[PDB]
From a paper:
Non-specific phospholipase C (NPC) hydrolyzes major membrane phospholipids to release diacylglycerol (DAG), a potent lipid-derived messenger regulating cell functions. In contrast, NPC harbors promiscuous activities, hydrolyzing major membrane phospholipids, such as glycosyl inositol phosphoryl ceramide (GIPC), phosphatidylcholine (PC), phosphatidylethanolamine (PE), and phosphatidylserine (PS). NPC4 is divided into a phosphoesterase domain (PD) and a C-terminal domain (CTD), and is structurally distinct from other characterized phospholipases. Mechanistically, CTD contributes NPC4 activity mainly via CTDα1-PD interaction, which ultimately stabilizes the catalytic pocket in PD.
During NPC41–496 crystallization, another set of crystals were obtained after about 2 months. A structure of this crystal was determined at 2.1 Å resolution. Residues encompassing PD (residues 12–258 and 264–415) can be well built in the crystal (NPC41–415), whereas no electron densities (including residues 416–496) are observed for CTD region. Unlike the structure of NPC1–496, no phosphorylation, metal ion and free phosphate molecule occur in this structure. By collecting crystals of the determined NPC41–415 structure, SDS-PAGE results shown that the protein was partially degraded during crystallization, possibly resulting in the omitted CTD in the crystal. Comparing the crystallizing conditions of NPC41–496 and NPC41–415 structures, KH2PO4 was absent in the NPC41–415 crystallization. Superposing the determined structure of NPC41–415 to NPC41–496, the architectures of PD are basically the same but with a significant local conformational change in a loop (including residues 250–268). The catalytic residue H264 in this loop twists out of the catalytic pocket in the NPC41–415 structure (with a measured distance of 8.4 Å), compared to the NPC41–496 structure. Correspondingly, other active site residues are deflected to a certain extent. It showed that the substrate hydrolyzing-activity of NPC41–415 was almost eliminated.
Author numbering:
A (entry chain A), B (entry chain B): 12 to 258, 264 to 415
């Protein structure tokens, strides 16, 4: 089994249908969207009783940040708002009908951004990566909540009860065991390449003296370690600082495309390219539309810890589908992975799939929680007998 | 008393003589340096004989970062290194003779940068601020240690035992009472205007919900509140993110001049200009040379907490002199404040002077610590009967 280096890049706040849904005309196998059988959500307002908003392919490069709190996402997936005076934590029916309404509730006119996705040619970096490697069109954010609970799952398969971006809790640090500790204890290496203060600092255990040395400034160390073949066994690329103090500004998809291109090309020209498995995913969907109902059946709480009031979240429902890419010369081009042949009938691909698959590939002894123990593993995406030799050396520049 | 808004900007890593020492030619009253009676430090090395390095005015805009740990500063001020096998915490004799030796010890050739200051004309923003307002030439960093223990003093008059930049300790947060809490309890407002993640988040008490709302993005909110005269009673401008993971890279003094210019002009064109007292100081001296012996007599420990081993620091010695500016239309131009007039015979101006003076100007009930209660207060710098009306509207662009 050729994979010795696993590289993880977690992007920000985009749904599958918004990012890749229109890539379906390039490959019908992609569970995306079409113009002929279009998806839609309705909007109610004081001025109008009902307006149908069709999911289109007119996403602009610059967009506001839609709502992605646990309470926003409740309205998006169930089509009705949370009501603390009439609490309905498990209403049963994720029909994905509330994205446009939740957008409008948060900011008038924002349903246009929420109800649009990108044309493939507007994201050439992604179009090339989809066509030359693999994606998963059934990969759900771990939590129907915001950025940090999901990021906590990426490297620990739990959020240790968190469903918000609680500045005090994040700074105090979350104490659960991380995949870094599993790897280290088994003698494997790991490195976190950061630009700004990384969200991985929110793991309290990584603040031990012996683990703080595994953080490396990205600009200094990343391209260098790629060039001389010195990448550790588990590489995390951390790019943005999370504004802990941000108690719906616009921003550009282009920066993320540039980062993906740079990271890919550095891995692609590395002597370790033939041992590398590169995963790109999104922390959560950002409030953008997606048509696939979030799983509500057979989803385990990772550690028995409930979320804070008023939601008292049971972690018995997944988040919304996000774009996930698998990139390796050992992968056939244009491959699309759906649900797992996961260990259980109701297993799903989600962020805990990353620690699960790391545990599987490196034969670590134990899973971290009940979530990585249950999540699908994607090591079977590595299918070739020999590494492909003509993988693109460079990708197109973002528009 | 005309002062209703106090604004604080803390710059990084520069000594008084390095920044303002050559202004003595412009104002003989300044305790600076001359060419005819020059300061010097000696260097001992293996290959070469003892070499005198004279303090010159040849500072370049780009310099390395000299040593400014508690152990480096011990050698700088006492002229001998710390010795854990022969510990000498209170050697008696701050002769300021070790800056060049300590520089060479950290990086060969670095004594040249450490033993140089700026020509006044090389820093036009500062030269204009000095000539149009006030400086203090006897203001000491609170701690002969690194960045964060000193920044803790600026808004709390203690470091709660800290003598290093301990990432785990900083993220856990320091729990001492802050001047923000003194102000809030007395009905006054405060605002922290930050660009990147602010060091004030290291105060644990500011992570409460009711205080997190007082943080404002600088780019969004600062110039705005300056225009509409909506500045709170205590303004902190936070500009740089401290890399907690940095376990001697070069950087440019020009960025700090640009920031100072931007902040000054925004306060100067504000309707609140006639009620504003703006203080600029430096967290500590960065390891650059200064000739004034650090006070070792009558310096109180703020709260009885000792520093960590091996130094077990008693907080009975001040840090090195830093540049400090007082800026307000109620200030006589070209004013230089020396040591304080009380509250005690051995009182000194230092970072705790900021909380002390805030307590004095706003008649807050209690000081925060024994340092606060002992430090000099500079309210007497406000001397005019009417606000000056021809304060510079704009400043020179940095070279």
């Amino acid at each position: 089994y050729p994979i010795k280096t696993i590289v993880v890049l977690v992007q920000e706040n985009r749904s599958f249908d918004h990012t890749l849904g229109w890539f379906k005309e390039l490959n019908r196998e992609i569970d995306g969207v079409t113009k002929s059988d279009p998806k839609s959500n309705t909007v109610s307002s004081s001025d109008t009783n009902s307006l149908r908003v069709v999911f289109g392919d007119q996403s602009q490069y610059v967009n506001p940040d839609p709502g992605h709190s646990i309470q926003d996402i409740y309205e998006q997936v169930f089509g009705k708002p949370w009501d603390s005076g009439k609490p309905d934590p498990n209403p049963g029916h994720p029909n994905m009908s509330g994205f446009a309404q939740n957008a409008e509730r948060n900011k008038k006119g924002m349903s246009s951004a929420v109800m649009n996705g990108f044309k493939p040619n507007a994201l050439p970096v992604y179009k090339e990566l989809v066509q030359n490697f693999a994606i998963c069109d059934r990969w759900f954010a771990s939590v129907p909540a915001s950025t940090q609970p999901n990021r906590l799952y990426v490297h620990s398969a739990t959020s240790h009860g968190a469903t918000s971006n609680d500045a005090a809790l994040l700074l105090e640090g979350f104490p659960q065991k991380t995949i870094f500790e599993s790897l280290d204890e088994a003698g494997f290496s790991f490195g976190i390449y950061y630009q700004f203060p990384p969200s991985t600092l929110f793991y309290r255990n990584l603040r031990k003296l012996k683990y703080l040395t595994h953080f490396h400034q990205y600009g200094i160390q990343f391209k260098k370690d790629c060039k001389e073949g010195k990448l550790p066994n588990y590489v995390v690329v951390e790019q943005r600082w999370f504004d802990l103090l941000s108690t719906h500004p616009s921003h550009d998809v282009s920066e993320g495309q540039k980062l993906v291109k740079e990271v890919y090309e550095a891995l692609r020209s590395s002597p370790q390219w033939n041992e590398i498995l590169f995963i790109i995913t999104y922390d959560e969907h950002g409030g953008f539309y997606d048509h696939v109902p979030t799983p509500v059946d057979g989803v385990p709480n990772p550690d028995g810890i409930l979320g804070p009031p008023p939601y008292n979240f049971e972690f018995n429902r997944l988040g919304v589908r996000v774009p996930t890419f698998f990139i390796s010369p050992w992968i056939e081009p244009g491959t699309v992975i759906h649900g797992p042949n996961g260990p259980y009938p109701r297993s799903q691909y989600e962020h805990s799939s990353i620690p699960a698959t790391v545990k599987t590939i490196f034969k670590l002894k134990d899973f971290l929680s009940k979530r990585d123990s249950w999540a699908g593993t994607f090591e079977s995406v590595i299918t070739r007998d020999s590494p492909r030799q003509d993988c693109p050396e460079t990708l197109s520049t973002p528009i």
